[PDB]
Design a protein around this ligand. Structure first.
Ligand code: VSZ
Ligand code: VSZ
Ligand code: VSZ
Ligand code: VSZ
Ligand code: VSZ
Ligand code: VSZ
Ligand code: VSZ
Ligand code: VSZ
Ligand code: VSZ
Lengths: 192, 184, 187, 189, 188, 189, 190, 188, 188
C-alpha cells in the first residue's frame, strides 16, 4: 500500500520525510513484519545510525513480529547489546518466536508490552535433506542453536534453561501480565 | 494518487497534516504498522488536539487490530472514529474503540460483526493449543467489546456466532457508535 | 505395449507371467511399496508351488524405499527356496543391497552390469525435537544397512561406512572382489 | 488407429507384436528405458527357453535411452545361445545404434534408407565439487567402456571412435556397412 | 471363447479389415504408428506373399525416419502394396502414396495431395547447428532423389516445386506422377 | 461406459455400436476428425464387404470438424456400391450437414426437431506474405469445391450457396427439405 | 530540490538509511551475493577510496554467500584499494560470506558474540555431453583449489586442513572462528 | 541494500551515476539491447564531455547478445578517448570479447578474476532452406568473431577456432599470455 | 538501471534525456506502438527546438509492428531537419527499413554492425472471407514496403522481392553496395 510523507521546515529548506523516517528522528524504530536478512539489515542500520547521532539518549523499538530467521534475529540482538544507548522494547499486537526473543533482549527495566499485546514462545524450526551424514550435521546444528537460544533466554527472563526447554516444546501463548510474570517483560504499559 | 502543492503533498499526506488518518485498506501487519506510526506522530505534534480516523475496512489480522487498538487507548489525544462504506470484523472493533461520545457512522454505511477465524493443522496436541488460543482470544475480544458497547459478554457471544449485518442506526442502538452523521 | 504368449486348454500369459511359471521374477524399476508388494507375493506364491526348487531374481533397479527394500530382503531370507540374484544393467542403492541378499554361491552380475553403493537419504522438516528424532532414525537405519552388508560381503563395518560415504560405482569384477556377488556370468 | 488384433482359430486373439513374437521377431520401436529393457530381455529369455538353436530377429527403430538399460539388453544378447539378428528400420541412434552393432556377426542389417547415428553419452552432475568429480569420473569411465565395446564390434580403433562420436555423426546404410556397424544393407528379397 | 468385437479400443474394425489385407492410416506418422504399420506389412507377407495389400492414407505426415521405416518395408516385401488416398495425404503421407506399386497408386476425386520440403530444429553451438543443417540438407536431397524416381520428374524440378507448400488436386496429382489413377465413382 | 450385448451363435459379446453395425447402422455422434473419419470409412468398407446389395444407415449428429476428414468420409460414401442413407438426429452442422446431403438421393432424412447448419469453411495462416498467400489461395479453392458439390446435391446455384453460407445459416427440418439438403422429414410410426 | 527526501528502506528518489551509513564509510552486506550485489559493493568501495584514501572502511556482513566469481569481484577490490577494510560479522557469514570475512584487513576482522561462521566446499551444475561435463568438473576442482589456497593464506591454516574441514558443512561459533583464523577478535559487549 | 545514494552537500546520485561522473562505467549484467544501449550512451556522453581523458569500463559479465556486444564494441573503437577494460569476477563469452576490445596497453584483469572464451550459440527452427540460411549466418558470424579476436591477441585464426570449440577457462595470468589482456592488475 | 547526469539552478537528466538535449535519439528495442510514439514525439520536439540543425538516430532494432515503423518513417520524412541514421549492432526488418529511410548522404553503419532484410509476417485466423481480406492486406503492404525500399536503395522492385523472400544478412560493406547506407563509419 502507501505510507505518508511528513514535510517539515528546517534551517536550510523543506524536508520531506518518510513516516517511519520521521519517527526515526525521535529515536523510534518500528519492527512490524517478519524478520529476514533485509529486515535485520534495516533494523541494524537504524540502530547504528541512532547511536551515531546520540550515544546517551534512549532508543525505542516497537515489536509486532511473528519472527523469522534465527540468524537475522541474532544480528539484531547482538547489535542491541553492543550499542551504548539503552534500547527500550515495546510489544504491541504480537511478538512471537524471534520477536519474543528480541523483546526480552531490551534494556532491563525498560521492556514493556501493551495491555492486549500477546507474546508467544516456542522451539526453533529447521529443514534437512540429502544423505545421513548431511542430516546429522544439520540435526546437530539446530540442537546446538537451540541450546544457545535457551541459554540466553534463561539469562534474560531469570527462568532456568530446563524450564525454558520444557515451556518451548510446543507453542506457548502468554498475556502481557503472564509475560511479565515469566520475566519476558518488566511492566505492562498503562494508558496515559 | 493525486498531488497538491503549497511543499508537494499527496492527498493522504495532506489530510494527515490536518490530523486525519485514512484506513481504507485491509488490516494486516503492514497497515497496522503505518496507523500506529501516524497516531504516535500526531501525539508528538500536539497531545491535546484531536485526531480523526476514517474506517472503511473488512478487517484482517486480530493481533494487528490490537496493535492499533492499544495505541488508540494509550495516547493522550481523543481519537474519533468515522465509519464510511463498511466497517466489518476487526474494522468494526476499531470503530467501537474510538473516544466515547465521538464515534459516528455515516447514514448508509454498513457495520458487520462476527467471531474470529483461525487455522489449526497437524498433531492432536498442536491442534488443541491452537484451539485453546483462539478460544481465549475470542473471550478477550468479546470482553473488550462488552466494555466499549455496554452489551453483556454472553450477548456479544450469541450475536457474533454468525455474520451479523447492522445498519448505521442499528449500530448506534448496539452502542458501537454514538451518533449517525447528519448531512450539513 | 507388452507382448502376450499362448501356451497350448489354451490360456494367455503376459511376458512376465510366463517367466514366473519358470520361477523367474523381473525387478526392473524403482523399488516402492507397490513393487515390494508385488515381488513378495511372487516369492510367497513360488514357495507354495514348490519349496525345493531355486528361484531366479533379475535385478535392474536404481533402488528406492529402504523399508520396501527390507520387505523383499526379509521374505528372501525367510522362504525355504534358494533365491538366485542376477544383476543386469544397474543395481544401485537398494538394488545392490537386494543383489547381495541372494543365496551364497548363487549371486551373479553380467559382464557389463554396474553396481552402485552409497549411504541412504532422508528428509526432516519441522521443530528441533522432530528433526532430532528423524536424524536418529536415519542414522540408526544406516547402522542396520551397514551391518547386514558386513554379514553378506564379509567386509568390516568401518570399510562399508568409509566406502558408502559418497556415491561408489563398481564394475562386475569389482563387485565380486568386494563380495556383493559370487560370479560374473560368461557367454 | 491403435495396434490391431489378429485371430487364429476355440478362438484366440493376438496383438500384432505378440503374433510376430511367435515367429521369433522382436520390435524395438521406442525410447530405451528400464521398462522397455525389462520387456525386451524377457522376450529374449522366453524365445531361448522355447528354442535355443533357431535365430531371433530384433527390429530396431529407437532414438536410444538409458545406457544401463541398453547394457541390460546388450549383455542378454551375448549370453544366449541363439544368434540375434539386428534389423535397422527408420533410425537407429545412440544406444539404438550400439545395440544394432551388438547383433550376431554376419547378421547385422539395415534397410536402404534407414539411418544410423553415433555419439558420446549425456549425463548430469549437481551439488558439491566432490559429488561432481565422482559423477564426472563415472560418465568418463562409462564412455571408455562404450567406446571400447564399439571398437571391438566394428573394427575401428578406440581413438577413432572417440573422435567420431565427439559430436553427432550421421551415417547412411552404406556408410554404416563401411563403418562395420552392419554386415549388409538389406536389399529387396 | 469367442473374442468380443468392438468398433474402437477385443476385435476392432481395423483388425477385421486387416483380415482382408487392408491397412488403415488415419493419423500422424510417428515411431508408434510406423512400428505398427511395419508389423502389419510383415504379418501380411507371412500369410501370403502373392496377394496384394491395400494401404489407405489419410496422414499429415510426421517423423521423416518413421516414414522411411514404412517406406522401406513397402519396397522390401514381395507382395504389391496399393496406396489409396482419401481426404488428405500431406508431407510424408504424399511421399508414401507415391511409394505404392506402379500402376496401383490411387487417390479419390476430392482427396488432396501436398508436397513440401522437410522441417527441423537446431539449438546450441555453431558446430552443433552446422551438423544439424548438413544433416537436414542431405535428408532433403535423399527425399527428392526418391520422389524423382517415383514421379518421373527431374530432381531440379522437385526442388523447385516443394520449396513452398504445394497443394494438388487428385487430377493434378496424377499429372505430377504421384498417383497412377483417380478412382472415379463410376466403376462396378 | 458403453453397454454391451451378448448373443448366441457360440456366445459372443458386442458393444452397443458394433451390435448396430450388424444391422448396418453407423453412428456418427462426435466432431469429425482424422481418427473419427478413419473409423467411419472402415465401417463403410467393412459393410460393403459383408453385402454389396443392402443399404447402409448413417445417423449424423455432428458439429463438423476437419474438411479433409469430412471429404474422406464423403468420397468413400460415393465410391461404395451400397446406397448410404443419411438420418439427421439432434444437429448436423458444418461438415456434418455437408455429409447429410451426401446420402443416396431420396434416402436423406432429418427428424422433426433436428437442426441443420451451413457456413463457409474456417482456417488459419501464420507466417510470411508468401506463406499466407498460399494458405489463403488453398482455403478459397477448397470453399469452391464445397460450394460446387453442395450446388450439385441440393439443386441450388453456386452463387446462392456462396451467399447463404457467408454467415451462419440455421435451418429447421422443413427448411432443409425445401432447400434441398434432405428429401423427407421423418414422422412417428 | 534544496533538500532530498529521507526514507529508511525505500524507482528511487530518496535518501535511504544505507546511504546515511555510507557517508560514515560503512557498507552493509545483508543478502546473498550475486553480480548485482557485488557491483554495488565494488562501486561503494571505489567511491569511498576516491573521497579519502587514508580513512578506514567498515563492511558489515550478514550473508549466506552466492556466486563465487561475484564474491571474487568484491574480494579483489578489497585487497586492491589503499584504505583498510574492517569486516564485521553479524548473524551469519556462510560460504562466500565467511570467505569475505576472512578477506578483511588483518587485525581488523571482527565477529559479534552470537554471530555464526560457516565454511564448506563450492557447489555447481553440469548438464550435457561427457566432454562438456569433464570441463565443468575440472573447472570446479580448480576453483576449489584456488579458494582453499586463498583461505590458507588468510587464516594461517594449512591447505590440507582447509580441504578436510570444508568437505561437509562446518558450523563455527565466534570463538571457534577466531581460533580458526577467520576473524581476529570477538567484539564482546563489555 | 539496493543501489545506494550519494549526497553532494543538495545533489543526489545513485552509486553508479556518481562513478560515471568520474568516467567509470560499470558493466555487470547479461549483455542485451537495453544494457548495450545504456553503455553506448554513456560512452558517447563521456566523449562529448571531454575527448582526451580516459574511460574505465569494469566487466563482470557472463555474456549476452552478439550484436549487442558489437554495438558496445564498435562504439568503443570509434570514439576518440582511450577505453580501459577492467575484469572483475568474470569476463565470459562476449564479456571476454569486450575485455580484449580495450585500448592496447590498458587492458587489465584483477588477480582472481576469470576469463572464459567459447564459440557462439544459435537457434534455427523451421524449413530446411531457413535452417541453411540460419546456419550460414552463425558460421559467418563466428568467422567474424575469431577474426577480430585474432587481430587483438596476436593468435592465429586456426588457433582461436581450436581453443573456442568447447568452453575454455583462463586465469588472469593465463589470459595475459594469450593476449586477451596486457597486465594483471597489482595491489598498491 | 539507467544512470542520471546532473548539469548546472541544477538539472537532473536520465542518460537518454542528456543525449536528447544534443539532438540524439536512441532506438535500441523492438518497434511497437509505445516505442514508435516515443520516437515520433522526440522528432517533433527537436524540430520545434531547432528546425535547421540535424537530428541523429541511432538504430539497434530487430524489427516490430509495420504500422508503428511507418509512423516513425512518415514523421522522419515530413519534418524539416535532416535525420541521420546510424546502424549500431543490428538493424533488422523495420529497423533496416528505417535505416535506409534517413537523409540521403547521412545514413551510416559501423564496421561490425549488421543489417538484415526480409519480407513481412502476418496472422490470419477465422472465416475464408476474413482470411482473403487479411491476405490481400499483407500483400498490398509488402508491395508498399518493397516500392519504398526500391526508391531508397536504387535497386529494382524485382531485385527487392528476390532478396527479401527469405532472411538476407548483409555486412556493413554489403549494405553500402546495396544502397541501404551511404557510408561505413571509420574509427577516429
Ligand atoms: C520464529 O520466528 C521462528 C519462525 C517463526 C519459524 C524462528 O525462530 C525459526 O526457528 N526460524 C527458522 C530458522 O531460521 N531456522 C534456521 C535454519 O534452519 O536455517 C536455523 C535456526 C536452524 C538451526 C526458519 C523457519 C527456518
Ligand atoms: C475480521 O476481520 C476477522 C476475519 C478477517 C473475518 C478477523 O478478526 C480474523 O478473525 N482474523 C483471523 C486471525 O487473525 N486469526 C488468528 C490466527 O489464527 O492467526 C487467530 C489467532 C485469531 C483468533 C485471520 C482470518 C486468520
Ligand atoms: C537407494 O535406493 C537409496 C536412495 C533411493 C538413493 C535408498 O536406500 C534411500 O535412501 N531411500 C530413501 C528412504 O527410504 N529414506 C527413508 C525415509 O526418510 O523415509 C529413510 C528412513 C531411510 C533411512 C528415500 C530416498 C527417502
Ligand atoms: C543415446 O541413446 C544417448 C542419449 C539417449 C542420447 C545415451 O547413450 C545416453 O547417453 N543416455 C544418458 C545416460 O544414460 N546417461 C547415464 C546417466 O546419466 O546415468 C550416464 C551414466 C551414461 C554415461 C541418458 C540420456 C541420461
Ligand atoms: C511431412 O510429413 C513433414 C512434416 C510433417 C512437416 C516431415 O517430412 C518432416 O519434415 N518431419 C520433420 C522431421 O522428420 N525432422 C527430422 C528431425 O528434425 O530430426 C529431420 C531429420 C527431417 C529431415 C519433423 C516435423 C521434425
Ligand atoms: C465445419 O465443420 C467447419 C469447421 C468446423 C468450422 C469445417 O468445414 C471447417 O471449416 N474446418 C476447418 C478446416 O478443416 N480448415 C481447413 C484447414 O485449415 O486445413 C481448410 C483447408 C478448409 C478449407 C478446420 C476447423 C480447420
Ligand atoms: C557459498 O556461497 C556457495 C553456495 C552459494 C552455497 C558458493 O560458494 C557457491 O558454491 N556458489 C556456486 C557457484 O558460484 N558455482 C560456480 C558455477 O558452477 O557457476 C562454480 C564455477 C564455482 C566454483 C553457485 C551456487 C552455483
Ligand atoms: C557469449 O556471450 C555467448 C552466449 C551468451 C553464451 C554469446 O556470444 C552468444 O553466443 N550469444 C548468442 C547470440 O547472440 N546469438 C546470435 C543470434 O542468435 O542472433 C547469433 C547470430 C550468434 C552467432 C545468444 C546466446 C543467442
Ligand atoms: C520486421 O520487423 C518484421 C517482423 C517484426 C519480424 C515486420 O516487418 C513484420 O513483418 N511485422 C509484422 C506486422 O506488423 N504485420 C502486420 C500485421 O499482421 O498486422 C502486417 C499488416 C504487415 C504486412 C508483425 C510481426 C505482426
Amino acid at each position: 500500500n502507501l505510507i505518508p510523507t511528513v514535510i517539515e521546515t528546517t534551517n536550510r529548506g523543506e524536508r520531506a520525510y518518510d513516516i517511519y523516517s520521521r519517527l526515526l528522528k525521535d529515536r523510534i524504530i518500528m519492527l512490524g513484519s517478519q524478520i529476514d536478512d533485509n529486515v535485520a539489515n534495516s533494523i541494524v542500520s537504524q540502530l547504528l545510525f541512532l547511536q551515531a547521532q546520540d550515544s546517551e539518549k534512549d532508543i525505542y523499538l516497537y515489536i509486532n513480529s511473528p519472527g523469522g530467521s534465527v540468524t537475522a534475529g541474532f544480528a539484531i540482538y547482538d547489535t542491541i547489546q553492543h550499542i551504548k544507548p539503552d534500547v527500550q522494547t515495546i510489544c504491541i499486537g504480537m511478538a512471537a518466536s524471534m520477536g519474543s526473543f528480541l523483546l526480552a533482549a531490551g534494556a532491563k527495566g525498560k521492556r514493556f508490552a501493551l495491555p492486549n499485546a500477546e507474546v508467544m514462545i516456542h522451539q526453533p524450526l529447521g529443514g534437512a535433506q540429502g544423505q545421513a551424514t548431511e542430516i546429522e550435521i544439520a540435526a546437530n546444528h539446530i540442537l546446538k542453536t537451540r541450546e544457545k537460544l535457551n541459554r540466553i533466554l534463561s539469562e534474560r527472563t531469570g527462568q532456568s534453561i530446563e524450564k525454558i526447554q520444557k515451556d518451548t516444546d510446543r507453542d506457548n501463548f502468554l498475556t502481557a501480565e503472564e509475560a511479565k510474570e515469566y520475566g519476558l517483560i518488566d511492566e505492562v504499559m498503562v494508558p496515559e
